[PDB]
Design a protein around this ligand. Sequence first.
Ligand SMILES: CC(C)(COP(=O)(O)OP(=O)(O)OC[C@H]1O[C@@H](n2cnc3c(N)ncnc32)[C@H](O)[C@@H]1OP(=O)(O)O)[C@@H](O)C(=O)NCCC(=O)NCCS
Ligand SMILES: CC(C)(COP(=O)(O)OP(=O)(O)OC[C@H]1O[C@@H](n2cnc3c(N)ncnc32)[C@H](O)[C@@H]1OP(=O)(O)O)[C@@H](O)C(=O)NCCC(=O)NCCS
Ligand SMILES: O=C(O)CCC(=O)C(=O)O
Ligand SMILES: O=C(O)CCC(=O)C(=O)O
Ligand SMILES: [Zn+2]
Ligand SMILES: [Zn+2]
Lengths: 399, 398
Amino acid sequence: KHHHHHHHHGGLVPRGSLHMKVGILDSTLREGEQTPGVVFTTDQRVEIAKALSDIGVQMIEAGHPAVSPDIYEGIRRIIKLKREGVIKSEIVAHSRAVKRDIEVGAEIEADRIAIFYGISDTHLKAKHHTTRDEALRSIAETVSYAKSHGVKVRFTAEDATRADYQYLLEVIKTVRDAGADRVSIADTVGVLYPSRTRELFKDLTSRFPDIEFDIHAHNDLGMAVANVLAAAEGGATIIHTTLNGLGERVGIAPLQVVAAALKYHFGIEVVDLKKLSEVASLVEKYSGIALPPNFPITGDYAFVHKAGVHVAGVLNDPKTYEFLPPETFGRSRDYVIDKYTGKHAVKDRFDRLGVKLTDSEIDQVLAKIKSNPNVRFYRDVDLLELAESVTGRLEHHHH
Amino acid sequence: KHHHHHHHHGGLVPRGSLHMKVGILDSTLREGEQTPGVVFTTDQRVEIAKALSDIGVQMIEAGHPAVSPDIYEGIRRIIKLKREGVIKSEIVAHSRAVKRDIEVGAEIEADRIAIFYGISDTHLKAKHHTTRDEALRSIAETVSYAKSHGVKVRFTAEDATRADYQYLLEVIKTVRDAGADRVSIADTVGVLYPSRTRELFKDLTSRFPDIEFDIHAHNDLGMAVANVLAAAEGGATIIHTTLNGLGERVGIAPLQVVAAALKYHFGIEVVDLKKLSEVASLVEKYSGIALPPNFPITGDYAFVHKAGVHVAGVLNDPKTYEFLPPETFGRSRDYVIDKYTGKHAVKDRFDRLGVKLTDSEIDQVLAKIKSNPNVRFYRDVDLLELAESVTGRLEHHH
Ligand SMILES: CC(C)(COP(=O)(O)OP(=O)(O)OC[C@H]1O[C@@H](n2cnc3c(N)ncnc32)[C@H](O)[C@@H]1OP(=O)(O)O)[C@@H](O)C(=O)NCCC(=O)NCCS
Ligand SMILES: CC(C)(COP(=O)(O)OP(=O)(O)OC[C@H]1O[C@@H](n2cnc3c(N)ncnc32)[C@H](O)[C@@H]1OP(=O)(O)O)[C@@H](O)C(=O)NCCC(=O)NCCS
Ligand SMILES: O=C(O)CCC(=O)C(=O)O
Ligand SMILES: O=C(O)CCC(=O)C(=O)O
Ligand SMILES: [Zn+2]
Ligand SMILES: [Zn+2]
């Protein structure tokens, strides 16, 4: 059900509402550990990998084993758990285009080796100190070398979204010929525009039908989610994510939001939607970066209503202010009470507390609530005290 | 292999040059006989149906049996040939939403009955004198009745492209529930804009995955070909054509152009491309309507070059001025000579004629050619006379 292969889809569902394929690669353990201030222990890494396997992630990028001894050891443990059937996702190891990295990737027995290289002109010049042609040779050699160990090879075209497009096409032919079966198109600095992303992937998939494409999208301009969905429309079959929007700088497409947007817009369930909160909370614990309360899907406030008009509507039909039911994600709605509330919301909360107030008493409590501008919420004890102030009586709920 | 089922495709081929499907329904025998001044005899109908089958058309719309006794007889003969396996295409009979048309369509044993009804506001009011709700009931009953005879049913939404879209969706739900497996979307007056056609079919195919859609596109604004390719982009699996642009008023999408355009842009071959000229000619003969010389693909001049600069280029590499090789369609290139010519062209024609002239003599001939403003063609006899007039030698087998 929450399996570890591709999910069939048909693109966007109809307005006012299966030949294509898509799945998740989660990079919490690679991209995600490149977040300033974030490091994971080996045990933490392993615990996260198991959680990602359990919710049905297709691929886990477990790290770049040359980076440090602990990353090597965490990847090894994960591959061992995979070999034992405890973990079921495909395990990907990252690699520079250097023989050493590749040999290490091969020796730990990863399912896939992802070789990256920067193929924009700034990267070729400033980062690699190389020419277009020399880069083509290095990439061909390293991809072939990795292939010859009998492991599947992805090539990541770093800064592809600012690269010369003709060169990008040449890069892809090169790595295809050298044995790569997947190419990741990396929007390294988050500058893709969604409608253009769709076009890009439509073009690439039409040109290279023997290759499957990944989208790796950074959120520098706040459009990572929209870019990954657009890529999927265009035929990308793997979307890279991290839990909680972890990664370099502002991070990449966040798993919980991507998964929800794919459910709503494409009608598919690429991971266990009901377990997003639990996995997000786990990563939050080990990463030490708190999710803001406004984070989509898993955020504290995602299904919390405030304005009186909204709460009144929700009490009649939650769909009025809820894009999908909270239960879709294993959550429940709530509402808060402050000076923005109204009579229906206040009545409903008193009803929950078992306190019967008259219509005019409700008016008086509402007026008292609205008389103070700088109170952030009214807790039940506050509301009980307000009622007492109106009834003169000592005022049953189990929470 | 020019078989008689759907052809697989993947939409447009990449810039700088399989989950979808498409095939041809040719309506030369139905829509095409609705061209002013065109009628076919029963014999000619049968012979056109055979040629349509031979080139690999998926569906032949062989006529509307209720219209006349000779149409009824032609269809009956076509169906007999289908039974005998001479004709292999699916045979479609047209029908109004009237019990008699349907019984008759059932009675001749057509493979499919196509019931049409006008679902735009002007059609409902001025032509059917009915309401949206009544139309729905009539359409439901008639489709159901046709389906109860155990025959496949297409519903044609006439004037769909100017109908209320919400109503069109209700129409399609209605006929689908009544048992229609195909719906034809008719751009009856040719007002579809191509990019909007793609969107229309994309939307309809996503909403009704258990129906296949046809496009029937008229050429009133010259965009029938662009419209049918756009419909195919969007998921239409049947494109309606006629040979030679036959049909009411200005006709519908012409088979030879649709077939070429699909080959170039989608990379597929939905009929035998090398037989297009032959079938166009046959239909030209029986319709009595000549194709203009500029008609694409099969026209006299489709692969005939004129300007000196073009002919010089083509003589070095024909691809310079040919979208695809003429042999694609079993044809050959040519060029003409008039005041627009140049030295490479004139030299080449003399070579064909076996006449050896010096460059100086070519220049003189060329100057004489360019001195006659109103000579339409220098035919070979004329060229031989020009060469004789320059060389003083005998030069002049056609
Ligand atoms: C990999 C790592 C151990 C290398 O450390 P290092 O050898 O001290 O090198 P530096 O970090 O100073 O990085 C630059 C070197 O890598 C090279 N390089 C960068 N990307 C490369 C690639 N895709 N293929 C080959 N070489 C690459 C640079 O040209 C440079 O080489 P140089 O030492 O000859 O100048 C270290 O950078 C690291 O731990 N990085 C974290 C992982 C990471 O950077 N991931 C990048 C994802 S794009
Ligand atoms: C079909 C046929 C013989 C009808 O002849 P007719 O009975 O003398 O009627 P007319 O052609 O004058 O008028 C059409 C009649 O059919 C009705 N009609 C039109 N389209 C219809 C449809 N899709 N379903 C049912 N009835 C329809 C009209 O309301 C009108 O009815 P009326 O007689 O009550 O006014 C005759 O119109 C004919 O041969 N037409 C050629 C085929 C044709 O018209 N094809 C159109 C494809 S869109
Ligand atoms: O391997 C990938 O797809 C992404 C590499 C990366 O982090 C980037 O270039 O942004
Ligand atoms: O049957 C069809 O598909 C087309 C009907 C027709 O004649 C039209 O509306 O143009
Ligand atoms: Zn990245
Ligand atoms: Zn028509």
